[PDB]
Design a protein around this nucleic acid. Structure first.
Lengths: 204, 178
DNA sequence: ACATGTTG
DNA sequence: GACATGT
């Protein structure tokens, strides 16, 4: 096989916009306790900018027990429970209380395991087409909160051979909401990808 | 208009379970100092069967006595003394019937009709019921009553409390559905 | 007790 | 709807 090295601190240590963009095309890898490796190529992300960002958990420099990850070293995972039963997987970027949410993966490996995991918690485009869908598919839960994506043995990021060029990256309004921050183009996805959670035609 | 009287001692002077069930479909009325009348149909209650505290004296008074207490230093719960040593019924939810706009300004996001009275503390806020109501008599008070029309109220579910919680089956106004 | 925040 | 979290 090819020489494989994980993306580390150097990759994660950039501001939220460039990081959210840089994630696109990179391959998120999960290794289950049974040894099964799950891979999904990132096709959709969102930037949360920090204190000024009315939509961010870190609005006004607010640090709470839950959102510790957003204020930890870049690369630190911030995984929280939303609507009681779903997870959102974020990665702390450079910048006070700034992070990147992963929203959608093209599944590459272990699709049958992703299917088993999600059906318990059917189509391939249904597996990772959403921030909480992808968490289920890759057995990611709160136990991953505050772990380091640069160093962890169970989850890591690999440089992916297929990165979108600037013109192929769509910038669009974020999903799930405010004010001027509900409309800001802080969601980024690969143009024409069928794995993306929500298409935005006006932005395209 | 119809000949309206109010429910009195005879209605309230029953055990906590019969009364908690009997409250469902009755209309609670609150008249504000400005003359505005607020109305809400009781759709969810809880019976408390008793075993004496400086705060629970209300539930140890004659049936129909209000027991209103502060919880989490902010909210209110409205309870009505029934027959039985220390027994009472909590009001948990109302269907808002009139004065909804007042209910909204008293409660004030954008909140809809289903958010006005869908909770024991929501309903007290909505009907301006506070501590100054504690130990008042529901059968005789001038600011708050349980009205009685020429028609009886209109299906009751007995569930665990939040089988001593009772609510109108499938009502969109019940706080928590089992 | 309340207010509020993706999936299907 | 969840139900985890933040006066």
């Amino acid at each position: 096989g090819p020489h494989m090295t994980r993306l580390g601190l150097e990759f994660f240590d950039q501001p939220a916009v460039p990081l959210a963009r840089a994630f696109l095309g990179q391959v998120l890898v999960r290794r289950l306790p049974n040894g099964t490796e799950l891979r999904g190529r990132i096709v959709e992300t969102e930037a949360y900018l920090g204190p000024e960002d009315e939509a961010a958990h870190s609005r006004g420099g607010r640090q709470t027990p839950r959102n510790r990850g957003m204020f930890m070293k870049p690369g630190t995972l911030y995984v929280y429970i939303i609507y009681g039963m779903y997870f959102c997987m974020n990665i702390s970027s450079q910048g006070d209380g700034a992070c990147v949410l992963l929203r959608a993966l093209e599944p590459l490996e272990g699709l049958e395991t992703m299917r088993q995991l999600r059906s318990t918690l059917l189509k391939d485009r249904e597996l990772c087409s959403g921030p909480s869908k992808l968490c289920q598919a890759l057995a990611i839960n709160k136990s991953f909160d505050q772990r380091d994506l640069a160093q962890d043995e169970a989850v890591w990021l690999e440089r992916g051979p297929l990165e979108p060029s600037e013109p192929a990256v769509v910038a669009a309004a974020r999903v799930g909401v405010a004010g001027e921050w509900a409309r800001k183009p802080l969601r980024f996805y690969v143009r024409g990808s069928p794995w993306v959670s929500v298409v935005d035609r006006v932005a395209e």
